Amino acid sequence: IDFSLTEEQRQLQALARRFAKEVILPVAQEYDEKEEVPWPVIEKLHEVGLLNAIIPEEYGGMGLKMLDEVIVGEELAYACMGIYTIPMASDLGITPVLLAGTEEQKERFLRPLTEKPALAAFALSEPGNGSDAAALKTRAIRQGDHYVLNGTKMWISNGGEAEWVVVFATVNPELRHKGVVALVVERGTPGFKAIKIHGKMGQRASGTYELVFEDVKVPVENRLGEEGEGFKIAMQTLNKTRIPVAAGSVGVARRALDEARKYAKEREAFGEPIANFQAIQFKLVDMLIGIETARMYTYYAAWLADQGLPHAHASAIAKAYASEIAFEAANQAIQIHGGYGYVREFPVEKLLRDVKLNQIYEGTNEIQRLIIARHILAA
Amino acid sequence: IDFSLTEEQRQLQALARRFAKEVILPVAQEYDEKEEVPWPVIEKLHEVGLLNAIIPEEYGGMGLKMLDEVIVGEELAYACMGIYTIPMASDLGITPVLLAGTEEQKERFLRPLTEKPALAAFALSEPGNGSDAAALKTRAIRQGDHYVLNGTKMWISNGGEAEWVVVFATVNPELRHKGVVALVVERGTPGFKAIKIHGKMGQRASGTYELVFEDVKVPVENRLGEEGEGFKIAMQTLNKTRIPVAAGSVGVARRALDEARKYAKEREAFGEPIANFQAIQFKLVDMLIGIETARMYTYYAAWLADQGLPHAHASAIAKAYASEIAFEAANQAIQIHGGYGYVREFPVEKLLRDVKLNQIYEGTNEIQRLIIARHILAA
Ligand SMILES: Cc1cc2nc3c(=O)[nH]c(=O)nc-3n(C[C@H](O)[C@H](O)[C@H](O)COP(=O)(O)OP(=O)(O)OC[C@H]3O[C@@H](n4cnc5c(N)ncnc54)[C@H](O)[C@@H]3O)c2cc1C
Ligand SMILES: Cc1cc2nc3c(=O)[nH]c(=O)nc-3n(C[C@H](O)[C@H](O)[C@H](O)COP(=O)(O)OP(=O)(O)OC[C@H]3O[C@@H](n4cnc5c(N)ncnc54)[C@H](O)[C@@H]3O)c2cc1C
Numbered sequence: 183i184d185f186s187l188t189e190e191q192r193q194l195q196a197l198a199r200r201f202a203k204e205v206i207l208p209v210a211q212e213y214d215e216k217e218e219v220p221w222p223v224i225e226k227l228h229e230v231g232l233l234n235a236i237i238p239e240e241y242g243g244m245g246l247k248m249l250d251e252v253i254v255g256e257e258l259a260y261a262c263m264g265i266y267t268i269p270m271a272s273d274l275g276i277t278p279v280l281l282a283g284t285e286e287q288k289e290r291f292l293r294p295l296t297e298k299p300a301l302a303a304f305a306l307s308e309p310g311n312g313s314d315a316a317a318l319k320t321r322a323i324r325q326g327d328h329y330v331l332n333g334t335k336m337w338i339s340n341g342g343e344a345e346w347v348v349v350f351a352t353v354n355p356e357l358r359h360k361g362v363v364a365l366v367v368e369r370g371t372p373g374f375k376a377i378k379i380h381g382k383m384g385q386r387a388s389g390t391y392e393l394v395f396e397d398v399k400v401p402v403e404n405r406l407g408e409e410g411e412g413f414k415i416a417m418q419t420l421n422k423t424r425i426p427v428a429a430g431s432v433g434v435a436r437r438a439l440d441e442a443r444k445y446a447k448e449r450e451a452f453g454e455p456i457a458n459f460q461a462i463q464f465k466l467v468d469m470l471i472g473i474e475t476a477r478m479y480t481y482y483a484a485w486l487a488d489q490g491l492p493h494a495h496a497s498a499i500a501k502a503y504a505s506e507i508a509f510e511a512a513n514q515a516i517q518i519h520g521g522y523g524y525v526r527e528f529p530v531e532k533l534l535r536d537v538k539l540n541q542i543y544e545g546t547n548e549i550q551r552l553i554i555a556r557h558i559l560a561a
Numbered sequence: 562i563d564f565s566l567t568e569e570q571r572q573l574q575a576l577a578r579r580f581a582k583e584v585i586l587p588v589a590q591e592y593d594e595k596e597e598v599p600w601p602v603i604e605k606l607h608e609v610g611l612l613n614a615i616i617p618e619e620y621g622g623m624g625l626k627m628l629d630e631v632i633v634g635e636e637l638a639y640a641c642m643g644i645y646t647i648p649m650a651s652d653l654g655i656t657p658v659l660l661a662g663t664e665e666q667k668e669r670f671l672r673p674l675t676e677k678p679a680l681a682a683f684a685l686s687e688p689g690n691g692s693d694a695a696a697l698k699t700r701a702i703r704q705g706d707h708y709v710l711n712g713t714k715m716w717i718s719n720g721g722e723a724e725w726v727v728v729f730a731t732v733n734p735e736l737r738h739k740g741v742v743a744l745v746v747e748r749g750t751p752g753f754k755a756i757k758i759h760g761k762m763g764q765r766a767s768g769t770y771e772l773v774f775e776d777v778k779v780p781v782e783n784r785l786g787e788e789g790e791g792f793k794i795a796m797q798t799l800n801k802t803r804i805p806v807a808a809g810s811v812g813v814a815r816r817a818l819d820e821a822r823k824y825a826k827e828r829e830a831f832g833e834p835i836a837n838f839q840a841i842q843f844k845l846v847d848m849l850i851g852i853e854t855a856r857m858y859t860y861y862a863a864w865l866a867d868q869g870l871p872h873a874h875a876s877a878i879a880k881a882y883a884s885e886i887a888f889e890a891a892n893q894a895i896q897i898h899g900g901y902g903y904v905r906e907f908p909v910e911k912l913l914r915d916v917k918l919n920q921i922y923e924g925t926n927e928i929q930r931l932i933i934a935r936h937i938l939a940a
């Protein structure tokens with residue numbers, strides 16, 4: 183057994199950390215408040231080579247592995263989870279094509295994402311259904327050399343900025359999970375509207391959209407895998423992408439520990455740094471306990487995935503656990519700042535608003551638990 | 562990075578598992594109810610080569626490392642934390658000799674522990690002090706080639722069964738911690754009494770003692786290290802021995818999940834197995850989340866110790882966390898069993914009683930937190 187990073191990983195880690203501190207950390211507050219996408223950051227990401235870096239070297243990417251994503255993710259999310267959600271969501275949309283796409287499609291859909299500041303998206307959730315990929319309403323009717331796509335997708339990260347979206351739709355409701363098909367819908371395709379969602383509690387920098395497909399014609403050359411394989415694709419993707427959500431959570435929790443501690447040492451009350459008080463020390467200790475345990479289990483999950491081993495249960499545990507300790511951590515970080523923790527003039531407040539989302543998207547912690555329960559009760 | 566196990570480790574794991582299953586588990590309740598040491602089990606451990614296996618091959622042992630300890634410890638504790646505490650505490654007694662004993666002392670003291678079923682003991686705590694280690698009252702005054710030992714040690718595991726006991730005493734209270742020295746004391750030495758403690762809530766199979774020293778003569782040939790080095794020896798020992806306590810906790814928690822799972826699948830209520838109820842599924846899930854995350858972090862801490870890296874904070878985290886999630890798992894297992902979990906005929910009730918101790922000995926979880934707090938605030 184070994185839990186050590188290789189020389190390259192440390193390099194990637196340092197790079198990531200360097201980028202977060204110098205580029206993300208400074209504008210985090212700005213975009214959270216304007217609720218606009220920091221394109222200049224995305225551009226900066228691309229230039230430093232960390233945008234869509236999971237794309238194999240054969241198509242221009244770094245071929246970064248899950249362990250690598252975890253390494254980078256924790257660093258980015260540390261500066262801002264909302265901004266980190268942009269590249270994270272992009273890797274999510276990329277995942278289906280990596281798993282099901284052919285060499286032709288990989289080259290076609292992935293090349294444009296390594297050459298310039300471009301994003302990919304994953305559209306599964308809908309207005310009336312976000313937790314059951316077996317009851318999706320968006321319909322795809324095969325009509326010759328193309329599918330006629332009709333339906334509304336909801337809460338799509340990178341929805342309006344992406345070059346294309348992996349849309350999961352049903353070709354037959356009665357077939358339920360077996361009726362799902364994966365389709366790549368490109369940004370200009372006629373009858374494809376993107377409406378931006380506003381007024382979110384956090385991760386405001388990340389762009390979330392409602393996507394409307396009106397008689398959208400999507401070529402069969404844009405289908406990932408075969409009809410009836412859409413569900414398995416969405417599930418296999420989520421089993422992996424949930425790990426980065428766990429990684430991000432860890433990053434937010436770490437950022438909460440850093441702020442809290444720096445404040446605890448400097449701020450005094452009753453003639454002494456509050457850090458000297460045992461009640462405050464224990465809050466800080468509990469943060470580190472969750473952080474340390476969540477990161478190690480997140481690394482283990484990434485390891486399993488990178489080894490081709492079963493990891494649905496592990497990533498579900500990592501995602502639910504990390505996001506939960508990360509939320510408690512931000513809550514206490516605010517508490518430790520006192521009145522100053524309640525205003526955006528300080529960073530702890532935004533941490534709470536950001537991290538809460540990690541308990542909801544890419545599957546709520548309840549279905550995460552439902553996933554674990556299954557693994558447990560299975561025979 | 563690689564979390565997998567070597568072939569040897571897998572064999573070693575199967576050995577412990579098979580042993581726990583065939584030898585320990587059957588007599589668990591029996592020895593819990595008599596509160597007597599199960600010597601026949603100690604012989605079999607020896608017979609099978611797992612008793613004091615941490616003693617390097619040069620002295621007749623297996624030279625097991627921390628990671629191996631964790632692997633074996635989880636399986637043994639799985640059957641019974643109380644019985645496991647016997648070899649665990651014996652490993653604890655052996656550690657100060659391995660960390661600071663000369664080749665000569667190692668042979669003399671450890672060889673007797675590999676040739677036959679024999680135990681070692683670690684005595685640091687005293688009646689009026691357990692957390693404040695650096696304030697020991699037991700005096701060790703030097704009179705030439707020997708020390709005249711006087712005082713009392715409290716809660717000593719394997720206290721009366723041990724061949725020898727590593728005792729931590731002060732050579733001059735005024736030096737405070739700089740005045741601590743470590744001395745091996747042999748089971749029959751004149752002026753050395755061992756009084757068995759009775760009425761423990763759990764881990765009853767393990768003998769806990771009060772040791773009384775009255776003008777006990779200890780030759781310098783029995784001092785581990787130099788004077789004023791006792792504290793370092795005690796701390797360095799605990800920095801490593803805490804990992805096994807975390808291991809046992811994970812073991813107990815695993816037993817709770819297994820019992821609770823089995824029982825929930827078979828037990829019907831409202832015309833359905835209780836395992837079909839979400840609330841029941843969730844309890845099971847939180848058990849696994851705790852088991853999985855706690856085990857990987859214990860592995861990690863074990864890795865740092867084997868690699869020779871700083872692990873004081875990591876082991877304190879693993880110990881505090883694991884014992885805490887294990888207590889909750891045992892509690893929910895009792896709950897899931899209903900009325901039957903409240904009676905000795907079932908195994909869950911004892912799990913709660915046993916594992917509570919894991920949050921107190923080898924450092925309470927509060928001081929574990931104090932240790933982590935220092936790591937966090939260290940300028
Ligand atoms: C900012 C944001 C961005 C997002 N970006 C994306 C994206 O890019 N791509 C994407 O595909 N999705 C995205 N989502 C959606 C997310 O992945 C979830 O699927 C979604 O939030 C589910 O939402 P809901 O409102 O549809 O459904 P609901 O399922 O109606 O919410 C149900 C509530 O009931 C509980 N619940 C539901 N079913 C059960 C059950 N069987 N047992 C017990 N409890 C149950 C839930 O846990 C939850 O608390 C995003 C969401 C947000 C908020
Ligand atoms: C069954 C059993 C077996 C044991 N076997 C051994 C053994 O083999 N060898 C050995 O050396 N020891 C052994 N111990 C002792 C154990 O390692 C601890 O040292 C011991 O439990 C301390 O107990 P206490 O009752 O002496 O003291 P206390 O320290 O008086 O208990 C204090 C309580 O106050 C809290 N507390 C204390 N100081 C602080 C502080 N500064 N800040 C915040 N909270 C604080 C604690 O967390 C704890 O809840 C054993 C204990 C038990 C119960």
Ligand SMILES: [Co+2]
Nearest residue numbers: 326327328399
């Ligand atoms: Co056509």
